Symmetry: D2
Subunit: 440 residues, 4 copies
């Protein structure tokens, strides 16, 4: 699955549709990012820039100019072609090929942006710019506007109104098209295959990072070169750290291992968590906590649909959690009082769900306490967890248990589609998978 040329074109037109007439929108590319000295991290394009272009180079700027309700055009600034630079660091699109390749009307050299940008903004009323996103972008934009402000004698006028396009653009990104959903569907399968493989490879005495290695290899073999976030492999007490990425410990028989890992496929994030026994067999104490987290997830998967919210479903999860913890003697008291006191918070201290897309924690307005009414096309995670600290004042057997189980879903007309159910989460199915792998 991929995003078509036509889709990128549709998105640009959808942005232009919302823009005032006599305006320009400026969308800047991500800078290259140093890892150490002269070596740089693998390039990751700005998600919003990528959303409108599918162009994976730095030093680029998309300019969408709306003259009126029927008349608009696009200008790309991008790196010029350079034989020496390209022999050394890799091929560049350049200006000639860009209009056709990316469906823009005009392409200019990024090295001329200071000489040309003010001319494109001259006489407009409004400029859409994400102020503070990148310092290099702010310098370029402020410099253009100052030229215009101070160029009265040259008959130049700056637009007096600057609008942040991020709210508009993030609202667009919040609702996935069919093409985006097909891509996220594949990201979900790829990620699921990685998680299955980790379960099948796990043995006592392997290190946490070994499962990371298996996962990343599986991502790569399906064409997802990079993870969407730094992989989490927390065995034992490390499972109680939500974004544990050290992955440095020997995995011990008797411990659980929590894997939070997701591929990046055509820019889109998969995001799965599976927790399972290092030795392939859950203990009673492990099952007792796992079953609460699993019921929370399964109930949420049943409930999520148009017209509810993350807040409303979270309320049900809290009830399931508080009830289960009371039955185990981890909480003491009346269930409804304990709920009213948020007595679950020492053990479940994060949200049930986040938006998912070009960013793993995706853009889009949640509303107060994530109360926004869900509609079809929204994509989100469902990730209940219980994390009992090594030093929690609870029965000894539950201490140092961290369990999270996470699926990715898209809201549909009648409910939701689960993108990540091809990896098992029922404990008996986990155990069968691991037994079968140990034979073979």
């Amino acid at each position: 699955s991929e995003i078509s040329r036509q889709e990128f074109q549709r998105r640009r037109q959808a942005l232009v549709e919302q823009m005032q007439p006599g305006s320009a929108a400026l969308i800047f590319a991500a800078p290259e990012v140093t890892r150490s000295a002269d070596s740089e991290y693998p390039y990751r394009q700005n998600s919003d820039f990528w959303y409108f272009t599918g162009f994976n180079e730095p030093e680029a700027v998309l300019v969408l100019i709306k003259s009126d309700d029927t008349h608009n055009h696009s200008v790309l600034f991008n790196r010029v072609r350079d034989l020496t630079a390209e022999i050394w660091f890799g091929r560049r699109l350049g200006q000639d090929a860009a209009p056709e390749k990316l469906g823009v009307d005009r392409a200019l050299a990024f090295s001329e942006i200071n000489q040309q940008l003010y001319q494109l903004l001259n006489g407009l009323d409004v400029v859409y710019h994400a102020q503070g996103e990148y310092a290099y972008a702010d310098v370029i934009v402020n410099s253009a506007l100052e030229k215009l402000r101070k160029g009265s004698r040259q008959n130049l006028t700056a637009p007096a109104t600057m609008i942040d396009w991020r709210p508009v653009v993030h609202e667009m990104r919040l609702f996935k098209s069919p093409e985006e959903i097909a891509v996220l569907r594949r990201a979900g399968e790829i990620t699921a295959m990685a998680h299955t493989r980790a379960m099948e490879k796990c043995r006592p005495g392997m290190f946490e990072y070994h499962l990371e290695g298996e996962i990343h290899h599986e991502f790569n073999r399906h064409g997802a070169r990079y993870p969407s976030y730094n992989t989490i492999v927390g065995s034992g007490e490390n499972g109680c750290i939500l974004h544990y990425t050290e992955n440095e410990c020997e995995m011990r028989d008797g411990d659980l291992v929590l894997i939070d890992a997701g591929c990046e496929y055509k820019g889109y994030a998969g995001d799965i968590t599976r927790t399972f026994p290092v030795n392939g067999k859950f203990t009673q104490a492990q099952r007792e906590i796992y079953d609460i987290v699993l019921e929370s997830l399964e109930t949420s998967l049943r409930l999520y649909r148009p017209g509810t919210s993350i807040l409303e479903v979270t309320g049900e999860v809290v009830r399931i959690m508080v009830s289960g913890l009371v039955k185990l003697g981890i909480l003491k008291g009346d269930v409804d009082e304990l709920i009213a006191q948020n007595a679950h918070r020492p053990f479940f201290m994060h949200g049930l769900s986040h938006w998912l897309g070009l960013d793993v924690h995706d853009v889009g307005v949640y509303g107060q306490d994530r109360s926004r009414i869900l509609e079809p096309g929204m994509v989100l995670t469902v990730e209940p967890g219980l994390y009992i600290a090594p030093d929690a004042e609870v029965p000894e057997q539950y201490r140092g248990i961290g369990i999270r189980i996470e699926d990715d879903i898209v809201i549909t007309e009648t409910g939701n589609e689960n993108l990540t159910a091809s990896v098992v989460k029922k404990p008996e199915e986990i155990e069968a998978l691991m037994v079968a792998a140990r034979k073979q």
Copy 2:
């Protein structure tokens, strides 16, 4: 292999030894680095900060204060412990454990650095600071010095002399200790095992990124989680791009594939290039170019020793290259004239060797044209290559061939030790390796 507590202590003392009395050296940690939105790249500590500490957290500053030739102390600024932040993002050393853990005299909270740093610099004559390395560091240091400058009435005085410690520290890093050499020796083995595996896995119809996946998995399984640089897998014409990292093409029977890849093991870079046939059998035209690059490497490995230089060995390589290219009809004319005209430069447009250490292109002064006399303990690469452009005006059979063969060496008392010879480079040995793997 690892770097000991004692070694980090020795390095600090070696820096202090060279410092003026009545001075302080400020070594700042790398910032965290955004990959996209709220997600960050895997943390990579500043190499120089790491060199003196082995401490892998951001928001940290090592302060070495020399009062006189016998009297000095160390202060660390680092992140305070925070239960919520650590539950979320991971464990922190904190102040209590730091003196013992890292062998410093005193540890303070980074959040108090603006309140405390000027007090440590008050009344000193000299401050060693790497100005321009990081903007956050410059703000902190300039702010401290301004307080002192303007604090005459509070009996404060700023040091008037600021010295860049990078030349001193990079000169130290240029000469590897026995411990560092043992670590780089292991990085070389790990990297070699990855390259062998790539050769054994390569088949026509696999993508360039699949060999990347195999390599990264092999790095990871030996405890080297990350590469030291972005892996290069250039098959066909992509082999003519020196830092080709797109790795996006289907590998075709008949093409060569050039793999430049290195692990990062305890901070230290492995760095190997092997070029080989995708189908396991070199053609005549491929052998003809390969043999020139291989003779260049083998001759350089024989020559490199104390008392020569990269420049001097490069001169021999150029002769080998120009002679081979004339025999193939790629160059025409007198060998010595062609050498004097640098007629090899369209086909070999980079240096034979770079320093290797905590950075893959390591710090340390090369001298003009890399003429510095080599001494024992210097670690460097040997990487001749020939890159014939798809459109070069040469016999058709050589067009679009990129070949590089690279080993990592340490200069010894009598010559050099090759750290990467455990992966094959003789063409018949490459072919036997790939045949054996294809059976199975």
Copy 3:
């Protein structure tokens, strides 16, 4: 004459009237400005900040918040009272007295602006801010908006629309109220008295700066402590430099002296130029050039009225100039051709008129080539000049003559009122004034 409390209130309401509902306007005070080391120049408030407040302190910010068409309020941030700081540097209004003194609803400490400003902007749709005016203001505003942008979990939202208020506010300042006109009327009288005195004091052998001293003393004695711009006293060839402020030369019998000087009275600029003979008697050559400049001025004073423009009146001046210069043999050819070739430009290289108000070169849109149709309440200068370079290829007697004659006017319903005609400009009246003074 002064500006009333009620007037400042009317201006604020007039700004609020034009603002969108659910918006705030931020108007920042001028910074203190170093002259050398720890000494600062006399404080000059930002003209726009002054326009809305009449408040003459630094570290202050006026915030006008419009909730809707009937509901708005004002918040001032200003310096807190401080006995030690005030004993040392002077009295401060503080917070208690400010509401009553300046007619604002609320006053807060400037030292708390970062803790309070984001709370005032929370949930608004629009912020009016003069971006780039002052760096300290930009830091404060950007910092407030980032808090809001990133404060989703604390139920904070930034206004997405930022509008430059300078066009709106400068359009207001372009039209003077009756109160402003009475103040500028007094500034014109004060400035005129200074110019008369300079003419009466001038003798050969006095320095250019001596007339500056006389002028500044006269400004001061009527309560205008500072000039509105740096005083120009160009005798001889120095009269050909438009903003000659060195004022360092001995004034020589036989030379003319050009004085461009204006007081600052209650913030408003007077702006007069008178050129006259150092020895009290114009030569023939001096009269010949002077009469052209004087006819230009007198004709412009007759012409300026509602419905014409600076451009249209300039056209008449150019004709008068080109004709006069042709009669003297300074220009050669057909008058209408010479006009079409702008042949006057080597001798008259500036505009006839600029807006006048809180700035000597006042704010307000001119239109292309100063073609804006004049309306009642506009205040402007009328300043024709002829400047014949020492090395101009013209008859010897005209070389090194610089003459400018400038009056300040307000456009009325039927024409204009001259604010500066109480100082003489007819040459015979100049000569009589100087003769009478010499007796003284």
Copy 4:
């Protein structure tokens, strides 16, 4: 009196003398400074830049390069000549005339400083730069050093040592040459004449600013166009504010007026305070406080000499003050206890003396509590004062009295020379001066 070409040359050589070999010193000019919109304050050159050049333009940089103990040269960067810019804003030295005019070896265009400065610093070991003095200077210097640091392949090397020259240069400025002393002697006379005139002009019902006007006129008529600091005219309770510059009040019969005012003559500051009765006759209560301040001054003038300090003389002043205040019942108790408790500090809350030169509060190290041993050539003020607050709990008659009497002195071989004694300070002489003037 003036500073000779030879003197500026001597100063430069004296700086070069102290510089390390293989070094360059960079001394930058002051920026132009906005007063409001497009109008700028009268230009004031950086004191240190002026000290070495006598050059009064912005956008200039003096570069002194020391190759070794006998070999050095000077390069000036300055504004290029421009007919249009000079016709508009005034004449420029340019490059051709600069070597001869300012005694430098070479002059280059400031517009080429980024292309040329790094070439001048290439291969040096040390750069002397006043870091943080001006932001534009820091940008230029850091930019030059980064080019060198990163220009290894172009055989460029940055100096690794940066030294602040301000301590060295301010130590030089602390000791005035005979030429400087003659200039300050004239500044003292000019300032004295202004103060005498203010006393002679003062009448009840005149405003504080009227005396300011008289003073500034007198400065100007002797060729000192500007004051060295903003003039202080505090009548009544305004005399209790140390840097009262509002000068806005009507001067009332019965009140004292305190005038702190100084000219700037050839860059050098005069600095005098005289306090006197508005009506020409001191009351008993006024005399009682005045006599304490006058004895303090007269005793200090007797005491100041080589080998004492400001601290040591201040101790005597404190004794005189505490004793006088006890006799008046303003302080109660034992004199020596009151001294030990610093009981004078509510009434005398500033230092007796500051260095005087190119800045009114001149550069140079004071030592702890101004304990530095005085040597010949040091120039300083002597300014005791007593300031009794309107609300001080003291006998009613002393409330709201501010008195300061200040002279400027140079330390000589045997004592001091008073530069400002040509204006009267004995009360009977003040009264006679004012009576004589009233007849006017």
